[model samples]
Target: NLDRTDDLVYLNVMELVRAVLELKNELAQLPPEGYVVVVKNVGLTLRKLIGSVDDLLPSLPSSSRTEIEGTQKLLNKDLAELINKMRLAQQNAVTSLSEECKRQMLTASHTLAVDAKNLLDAVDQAKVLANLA
Candidate 1:
């Protein structure tokens, strides 16, 4: 993810906050393997968003920083939860694979992928929220 910097174009602060919040919410929805992947995605997005802000907002007061930090802390907590979910998903996937054909075992992955597709579509719909002229 690109770091936040002054030149990056964010729609607005509220949009930026909402974007991070949405990603964090999505990260919480996945199973272990999916969760980790989602977290990595979310982290990348957060990195770019925050990095840009950090570069541009060097003079920002501690109060705003505190809010951002609080949001980040929540995101981190969710990311950790995702890691645990990913582990369990992998273990279950492995067990299923051992008991069934590899292709059949991938059913869980397929389901998750489908759900992820729907999620991305939802995010796309939400993309309109940042309607800046």
Candidate 2:
């Protein structure tokens, strides 16, 4: 009984960790450099979540059934928040970079004609990220 319960808990937590790692890898591939850092925070938070799961898993069988019921009820929201936070991080990264880029364009255009293509590209990247949610 103990072994079976442990397996189930570990399996759940490990799968969650694997998903987090995949998200981290996807984040690492973003075009802009700064986005990776924001993504790293998301990854870290997910890891912490998994760690919390791991900490509780071994005790699961002994835990009140109410604990399991509560976790089942709340896990979806907790996981959804993690996703929301990650998406928010990505969108903010794009928005902030795009704003800074537009500002730089404004400064440069004062002296030289800023490339329309570059501005358009930045705006497009930002739009894509913003709408990813």
Candidate 3:
């Protein structure tokens, strides 16, 4: 019974993690301009995922929680940078190819994407170590 319960908890946490990773990937692929609506959607999704993580925090093992929290922090920082860069570009009325600002946005998106991948890899490693996957 205890084992099953732990397994369920792990599965639920992993599911939420996967969803978050998907959202991060989508955010990473957005164009520098014309993505305000999409960015807003992604932000909403990310907020929901963060909420889910908070709700599940008590159920996650210490190791998983530590790795997940690290990823979350990275994502938050990157997202903030991207948002600021987007607003700066928009204020200039640059539709596309703003060059410098676009480059910065892409860099932030790439970093966020890589961090999400790292989180996914960490989750896989944890599951394997526990023989849960």
Most accurate candidate by TM-score: 3
lDDT of 2 at 49: 45
RMSD of 1: 11.2
Each candidate's lDDT (Cα)?
A: 0.43, 0.41, 0.59
* Two-way lDDT contest, 1 vs 3, winner: 3
Please provide, for model 3 over 1-133, each residue's C-alpha lDDT reduced to its tens digit, 9 standing for 90 to 100: 2243534334543554454345445544555444676556546655655665566555556788787787778778867986887777566555454656656655665565566556556655655555552
Model 3, TM vs. native:
0.61
TM-score of each: 0.39, 0.38, 0.61
How does model 2 score by TM-score? 0.38
Report per-prediction Cα RMSD to one decimal: 11.2, 19.7, 6.3
Whichever of 1 and 2 has more lDDT, that candidate is 1
Model 3 lDDT, residue 84, Cα: 86
Sort order, lDDT high to low: 3, 1, 2
Q: Count the backbone clashes (under 3 Å) in each candidate.
A: 9, 0, 0
The stretch of ten residues in a row with the least summed lDDT in candidate 1 is 124-133
Candidates 1 and 2 compared by TM-score, better number:
1
- Model 3 residue 23 CA deviation in Å: 12
| Over 4 Å off, model 2 | 1-6, 31-63, 90-93, 97-133
